[PDB]
């Protein structure tokens, strides 16, 4: 019942208190998010939003939380959905 995650200095602390949560199959998360962290960090910078993926659930579902102002949240959600749709096809 405790998770840690670094916060970049440029991210305001005012926007860390209203996430967006959507669910997806855990089989696609490991191939969309990937293993490296540099690409994820660059996506976070350009979208100006922060995301975390947790797959501790026993089911095939994965939980995604995205932090930022609504427009950035929407844009990052669209990017992730498009990547998932491409990888599923």
């Amino acid at each position: 019942s405790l998770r840690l995650r670094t916060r970049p200095w440029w991210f305001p602390i005012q926007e860390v208190s209203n996430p967006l949560v959507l669910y997806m199959e855990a089989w696609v998360a490991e191939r969309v998010i990937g293993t490296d962290q540099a690409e994820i960090s660059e996506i976070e910078w350009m979208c100006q939003a922060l995301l975390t993926v947790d797959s501790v659930n026993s089911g095939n579902l994965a939980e995604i939380t995205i932090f930022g102002q609504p427009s950035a949240q929407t844009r990052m959600k669209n990017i992730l959905l498009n990547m998932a749709a491409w990888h599923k096809e």
């Binding site: 405790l2 840690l4 209203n18 939380t65 929407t74």
Partner: protein, 949 residues
């Protein structure tokens, strides 16, 4: 002697056997003191998070783990500080604090010699010290063994000015970071979180009663971010579950609502006092004083940003730990600390906010001061204060205190909500949403009903489902609403998305997503309102199903919306539902469909629907809808057929020769009844214009014709004059804003205007007409047989040579009542010449436009004399001109005269010195009906922008 200290710290810190382990989250903390970049290696780490998560336990685990192994090996010494258990007003030294922490004092002298490079400080709780600093100037201590108050010592430690090249770990709160981030040098931030969202959802789900209202209450609780986010702490979730279980067991004898944090907290607190009472009765006099003292202490602590409440603070309000313990028998005001002095903190900050909010309710019940011997941080208190207005809680308070409870702050809250509704240039949507969220917390119809009575116009942005629910709840009581606008950018973009939150479905049989039913409830709320008659979709993106639901709800018999706007929305998918809606809602008579491309079948269905006897649409705007030849043929067939259409717009789409002749054949026929036609920014050529006017020659129905931003030749103007010459023309307003008219065409126009009625408006903006043609125009306007009422010359090329002519025309004219001179370089001599004939007020001119006329501070005396004695003038524009201080003072003194009757003045008042601003304020004070706003063109007494909407 290090082994003895390590054994002592092991013995002292042992309270978590199943909570402290080599978790995957902790190796990040161990590695954090390593160079991420080869150049950079951080020296300060700040752990921030919500109050209820285990940051202090994490720091204690760090200290314990260093004492055994696998956690820290380079750090030779780790020192743990707990600042909320000590007093920071005494004067001491750093050596004394460590000596208190470290039993052996002989180790430190050899320690300081080589340790500063390899040494770690762990400071727990520097959140209560945000108020100790005077914020004026703090003296920096540079070396230890200095007798100074310990807050200065901590200030020097944080600045790397006391013990440099040493590592610091600081545990703090999210809201206590405003003053600390400037002090520390390049820290690293770690965000700590509690239990996950799925675990939280399951825990909430087990405890809900499930007697026929489980789904709605469950969704009301889970989607509320204010409650759901702060429920991260296990203690808060345990409190919520205990309150939910208590309500079900206390079934009928509990009437407090269960959808909000305020209702659940009142349930626990107020029931707890009842168990003390041997029978249902009132509080004793002494216990009332204790409760009031507790509330007042909590409120003062909230205001002063304090959360420790030392012993002397308790004696200020005459409190006692025994009294509070024996009054509640519940976990309130826990005692912490180990030294002689004691500290008392609330079990959770939510309880302190609850009591601080409760203080405002009981403050006026009596004279309580006899028995006492004395913006983010205020969000929770404000939410609790708004929530405590529920009438069910006040009845319990009346039962306990024996007197009726009517707080004074209720009027203040209602007045604040009312101030938002009445604004001069529209209402801010964010304040509207905040007010709606606040009013949703008090599940009271009288309070919410009386707070919302002055809106009359609402702009709303929706990007969450909770927004839909709170807006649906609050909009039911807005009985005076007349216009709304909703912006839903992304909530309804995708048509199909089927997912479930837990491993198993929340409900066994749902058959429909939660979003769709809440959307339908909102749409039915919109369709039930009586006085609302304008709906604008803003910048919404809608799928097929959403638009279908909207249309089916708007088809209802109780919907009286007259105007529908889609000029900035993407609704291409639901056009079939739109067409079916068109001829079943008979109250709709204005449809704006700009920027939505129309295909062949869509246009065919739209025309077929418009031909229906049950359609009552009278205005149809169809600009930027890319049309085809067959579309133009069907438009002509619609025009010739039976319809109730009176206004048609086809702006910003090119028209070909064949389409033009078909349209002209439609217009020339006697079976067409169309009043207004807008044809600006089309593909009109001089040949096409000639053909159009030739076809219109036999028409006797069109009264408004706009032909702006086209190309018109001299033959076209002659044909227009020929069409205007014959009787029974019935043309009232002509607009030609950018068509190029030059030379003789102005002469034909003057010949027509010399003797012509039924033509009252004429706009000639942005045309190259100089003083020569203005001679003819003024000569034509001087005759008594000219009924023109408004003339616009905003961007025509004019100089001061025609100003005497303009003044003579103004003196002699008896019908003109508006004259616009927008971008003409008249100068000061021309303006003085004009004012010579203006000051006598020989005519009924009521609107003069003198913006951007290049006026210095030389004509100010003549202007002031002209407008000092001129009762007829009502409006005046003076923007984009240079006025000195003396000229502005003269203008203001002329404004203050009791003879002038100016109603609208166009000035930006934020461009003048303080004295001129004071004079303007005095002018506004003397005459209360004067509006001083720079947006001069936003005032329309008559329909002037009929061709721009």
């Amino acid at each position: 002697d290090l082994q003895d200290y390590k054994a002592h710290v092991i013995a002292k810190f042992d309270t978590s056997v199943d909570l402290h382990y080599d978790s995957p989250e902790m190796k990040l903390l161990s590695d954090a003191f390593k160079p991420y970049q080869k150049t950079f290696q951080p020296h300060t780490i700040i752990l921030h998070g919500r109050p209820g998560v285990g940051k202090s336990a994490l720091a204690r685990s760090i200290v314990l783990g260093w004492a055994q192994g696998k956690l820290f090996q380079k750090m030779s010494f780790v020192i743990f500080f707990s600042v909320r258990e000590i007093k920071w007003t005494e004067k001491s030294s750093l050596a004394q604090l460590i000596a208190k922490e470290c039993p052996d004092s002989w180790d430190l002298v050899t320690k300081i010699m080589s340790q500063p490079e390899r040494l770690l400080f762990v400071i727990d709780g520097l959140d209560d010290m945000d108020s100790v600093l005077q914020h004026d100037d703090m003296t920096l201590s540079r070396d230890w063994k200095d007798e100074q108050p310990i807050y200065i010592l901590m200030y020097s430690l944080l600045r790397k000015a006391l013990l440099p090249q040493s590592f610091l770990i600081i545990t703090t709160r999210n809201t206590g970071l405003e003053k600390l981030k400037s002090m520390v040098v390049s820290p690293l931030y770690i965000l700590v979180e509690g239990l996950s969202a799925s675990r939280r959802s399951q825990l909430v789900l087990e405890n809900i009663s499930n007697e026929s209202d489980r789904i709605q209450v469950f969704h009301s609780l889970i989607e509320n971010h204010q409650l759901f986010d702060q429920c991260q702490a296990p203690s808060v979730c345990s409190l919520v579950c205990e309150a939910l279980q208590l309500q079900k067991k206390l079934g009928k004898r509990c009437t407090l609502p269960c959808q909000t944090l305020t209702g659940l907290y009142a349930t626990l607190v107020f029931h707890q006092l009842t168990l003390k009472r041997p029978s249902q009765s009132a509080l004793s006099q002494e216990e009332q004083i204790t409760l009031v003292g507790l509330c007042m202490m909590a409120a003062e602590g909230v205001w002063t940003m304090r959360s420790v409440f030392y012993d002397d603070d308790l004696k200020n309000y005459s409190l006692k730990e025994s009294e509070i313990l024996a009054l509640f028998h519940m976990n309130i005001l826990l005692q912490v600390g180990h030294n002689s002095e004691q500290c008392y903190v609330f079990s959770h900050l939510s309880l302190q906010d609850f009591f601080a909010a409760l203080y405002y309710v009981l403050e006026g019940l009596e004279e309580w001061n006899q028995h006492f011997c004395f913006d983010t941080r205020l969000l929770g208190m404000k939410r609790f204060l708004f929530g405590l207005m529920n009438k069910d809680i006040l009845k319990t308070l009346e039962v306990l205190f024996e007197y009726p409870v009517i707080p004074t702050v209720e009027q203040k809250l209602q007045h604040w909500v009312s101030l938002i509704a009445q604004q001069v240039n529209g209402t801010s949507p964010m304040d509207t949403l905040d007010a709606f969220y606040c009013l949703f917390e008090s599940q009271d119809e009288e309070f919410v009903g009386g707070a919302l009575k002055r809106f009359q116009e609402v702009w709303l942005l929706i990007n969450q489902k909770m927004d839909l629910k709170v807006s649906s709840y609050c909009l039911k009581h807005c009985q005076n609403l007349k216009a709304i606008r909703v912006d839903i950018r992304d909530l309804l973009s995708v048509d199909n998305t089927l997912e479930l939150c837990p491993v198993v479905t929340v409900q066994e049989t749902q058959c429909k997503p939660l979003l769709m039913e809440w959307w339908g409830n909102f749409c039915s709320v919109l369709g039930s309102l009586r006085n609302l008659k304008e709906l604008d979709l803003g910048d919404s993106i809608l799928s097929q199903r959403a638009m279908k639901i909207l249309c089916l709800e708007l088809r209802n018999q109780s919907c009286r919306i007259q105007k529908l706007t889609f000029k900035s929305a993407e609704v291409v998918s639901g056009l079939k539902h739109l067409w079916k809606l068109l001829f079943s809602n008979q109250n709709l008579k204005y449809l704006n469909l700009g920027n939505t491309p129309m295909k062949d079948d869509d246009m065919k269905l739209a025309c077929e629907a418009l031909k229906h006897p049950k359609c009552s649409v009278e205005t149809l705007r169809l600009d930027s809808c890319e049309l085809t030849i067959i579309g133009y043929e069907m438009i002509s067939t619609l025009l010739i057929s039976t319809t109730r259409l009176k206004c048609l717009s086809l702006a910003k789409n090119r028209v070909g020769v064949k389409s033009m002749i078909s349209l002209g054949n439609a217009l020339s026929s006697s079976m067409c009844l169309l009043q207004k036609l807008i044809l600006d920014n089309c593909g009109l050529t001089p040949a096409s214009c000639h053909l159009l006017v030739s076809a219109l020659f036999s028409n006797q129905n069109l009264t408004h014709l706009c032909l702006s931003n086209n190309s018109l030749g001299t033959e076209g103007v002659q044909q227009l004059c020929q069409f205007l010459r014959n009787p029974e023309c019935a043309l009232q307003r002509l607009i030609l804003n950018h068509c190029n008219i030059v030379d003789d065409a102005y002469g034909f126009l003057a010949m027509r205007l010399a003797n012509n009625t039924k033509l009252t408006h004429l706009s000639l903006t942005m045309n190259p007409v100089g003083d020569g043609a203005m001679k003819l125009l003024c000569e034509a306007l001087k005759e008594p047989t000219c009924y023109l009422q408004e003339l616009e010359l905003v961007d025509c090329q004019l100089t001061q040579n025609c100003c005497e002519d303009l003044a003579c025309m103004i003196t002699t004219t008896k019908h003109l009542k508006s004259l616009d001179l927008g971008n003409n370089a008249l100068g000061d001599k021309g303006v003085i010449t004009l004012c010579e004939g203006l000051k006598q007020s020989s005519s009924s001119l009521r609107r003069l436009g003198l913006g951007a006329c290049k006026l210095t501070s030389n004509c100010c005396e003549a202007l002031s004399l002209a407008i000092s004695c001129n009762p007829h003038l009502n409006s005046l524009n003076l923007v984009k001109n240079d006025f000195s201080t003396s000229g502005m003072l003269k203008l203001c003194s002329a404004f203050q005269c009791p003879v002038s009757n100016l109603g609208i003045i166009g000035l930006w008042k934020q461009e003048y010195y303080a004295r001129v601003r004071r004079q303007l304020e005095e002018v506004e004070f003397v005459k209360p009906h004067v509006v001083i706003d720079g947006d001069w063109y936003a005032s329309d007494e008559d329909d002037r922008n009929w061709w721009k909407n």
